[PDB]
Amino acid sequence: MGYLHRVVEGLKANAGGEALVSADRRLTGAETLEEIHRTARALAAQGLRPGDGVVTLHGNGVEAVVLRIAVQLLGCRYAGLRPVFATREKANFLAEAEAAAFVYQPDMADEAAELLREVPTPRVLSLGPAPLGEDLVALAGAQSAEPVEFTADERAATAVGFTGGTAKGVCRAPFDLEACLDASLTIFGEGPWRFLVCIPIADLGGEMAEWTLAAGGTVVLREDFEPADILATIGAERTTHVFCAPGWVYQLAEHPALADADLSSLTQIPYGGAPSTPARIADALEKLGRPLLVHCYGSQEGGWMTWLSAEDHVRADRYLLNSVGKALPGTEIAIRDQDGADLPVGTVGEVCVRSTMLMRGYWRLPELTAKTVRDGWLHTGDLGRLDTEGYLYLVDRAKDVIIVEAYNVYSQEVEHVLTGHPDVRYAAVVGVPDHDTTEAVYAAVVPAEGVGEIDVDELRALVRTTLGPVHEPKHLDVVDTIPTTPHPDKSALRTRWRA
Ligand SMILES: Nc1ncnc2c1ncn2[C@@H]1O[C@H](CO)[C@@H](O)[C@H]1O
């Protein structure tokens, strides 16, 4: 239909229902559409035309979703900066963006000043009253809400998400965005949803909000994940979905307030983005008490690639918690060797994917794009193996593989064996220098609750008799905690091992 057409049709289908809900503001579908139309006119009145870059700096307010959609309705290129990014990383993105405008949240004017000092930008605009540039919400306030039709090229990029790559802005056009929408309906089920987005509107949260609106639903916004707030919100706002990082799942399931929370409105807790720990997902199932969990494997480059359904989490005759599920309709998966050759089902190699959800490409990085997408196939930089039912099992990121005297030890697979043991809650496996074998296998393991001394020889034996001898951790370190990224922090583990 056209992506922005899909979004607007959803909002019209929900004209009298709630569409954008935060702690501070609640808009109906019709109200949301009006704000979009008038914000779009305000932006066009500032001189913005199709293909103009619009860089933003905001949190997850209603104003932010409105802005994101309005920018794209014009056919401009939305480039959202995450607040969490370092100021210097922000400047770099801003410099690279060829920005025709910079739109910032008033709250954040200090940092906006730093950035614009580094990278002077025309059309500085604020989401409300603020020191720098003009007040976009004021300007939108005073335009007509007469509809603005999308007339730009469905194929030209309207959004740039920062944090692809295995820095990197990932360009997305309406075409690939609509395909992502269609896939989300397969994963999340038919709309309307009441979808708790606590992920940045700057990128993935913003996409999920778009899809929610497009399928006729309500976006329930939070700035970030805090388990007590989320448990309360699910009940108070009657959410059908909340998209989680795997660790968030475990925090919900283990929280003391879970008993008192009302989860009855949930249809799903879709999760992914980082490797799950199967045994911890198994505990979460039990604690939640019904098949809510849906495992989602995707990337900014690839869109949605596979999903494991809620019912496949509890399939009677299989155990699939170490799988990321099966291909989305329309998605082809090939598992390839180092030379690019397709491997028979069952073999480990690089996960490569072809679908209409593929990104347009990396913003201004043509060499890397041609390296990453070859003959229409995304090379994910993940390693894995399919089975005869079509389930995909990720065994490593290519960069994490540990080479022990010419043998390949897949760190995530070893981790799953360790965490599978009842004594082990969490594990991280990394390679360290070895005089004899070049690399040796190092594992850090966090004991489970009610576990005393880990039997390290038991753990080595389990790995040995599941994967084979070379997969065994030579070095096995009991730790209190596994360091994290802003994924588990494998470089940090590698470093702390020397000392
Ligand atoms: N559900 C998931 N399970 C494991 N790793 C994932 C999942 N979703 C995303 N990833 C990882 O993060 C990357 C996305 O930027 C993937 O290519 C993959 O390595």
Author numbering: 1 to 166, 170 to 489, 492 to 504
Question: What does the published report state?
Answer:
In order to explore the basis for the broader substrate specificity of ShABS, the three-dimensional structure was determined by using X-ray crystallography (SI Section 4). As crystals of wild-type ShABS were initially not forthcoming, two mutants, K492A and K492H, of a lysine residue K492 implicated in interacting with ATP were prepared and subjected to crystallization trials, in an attempt to obtain a structure. Although no crystals were obtained in the presence of ATP or AMP and acid substrate, the inclusion of the noncleavable ATP analogue α,β-methylene adenosine 5′-triphosphate (AMP-CPP) was successful in giving diffracting crystals of ShABS K492H in the P21 space group, from which were obtained data sets that were refined to 2.01 (Data set #1) and 2.57 Ångstrom (Data set #2) resolution, the second of which contained density for AMP-CPP in the active site. This structure of ShABS (ShABSAdFigure 1a) featured two molecules in the asymmetric unit cell, each of which corresponded to the “adenylation” conformation of McbA, with an rmsd between the two enzymes of 1.50 Å over 469 C-α atoms. The major differences in active site residues between the ShABSAd and McbAAd acid binding sites were W307 (ShABS) for F301 (McbA), W214 for C209, R175 for H170, C299 for N293, and S302 for T296. The presence of the two tryptophan residues is most likely to account for the differences in acid specificity between McbA and ShABS.
Amide Bond Synthetases (ABSs) actively catalyze both the ATP-dependent adenylation of carboxylic acid substrates and their subsequent amidation using an amine nucleophile, both within the active site of the enzyme, enabling the use of only a small excess of the amine partner. In this report, we describe the activity and specificity of an ABS from Streptoalloteichus hindustanus (ShABS), with a broader, complementary substrate spectrum to that of McbA that includes enantioselective behavior toward an expanded range of acid and amine partners in amidation reactions. The requirement for large excesses of amine in these reactions has prompted investigations into the ATP-dependent amide bond synthetase (ABS) class of enzymes, also members of the larger ANL (acyl-CoA synthetase–non-ribosomal peptide synthase–luciferase) family of adenylase enzymes, as these catalyze both the formation of the adenylate and the amidation reaction within one active site of the enzyme and require only one or low equivalents of the amine as a coupling partner. In common with other adenylases, McbA features a larger N-terminal domain coupled to a C-terminal “cap” domain.
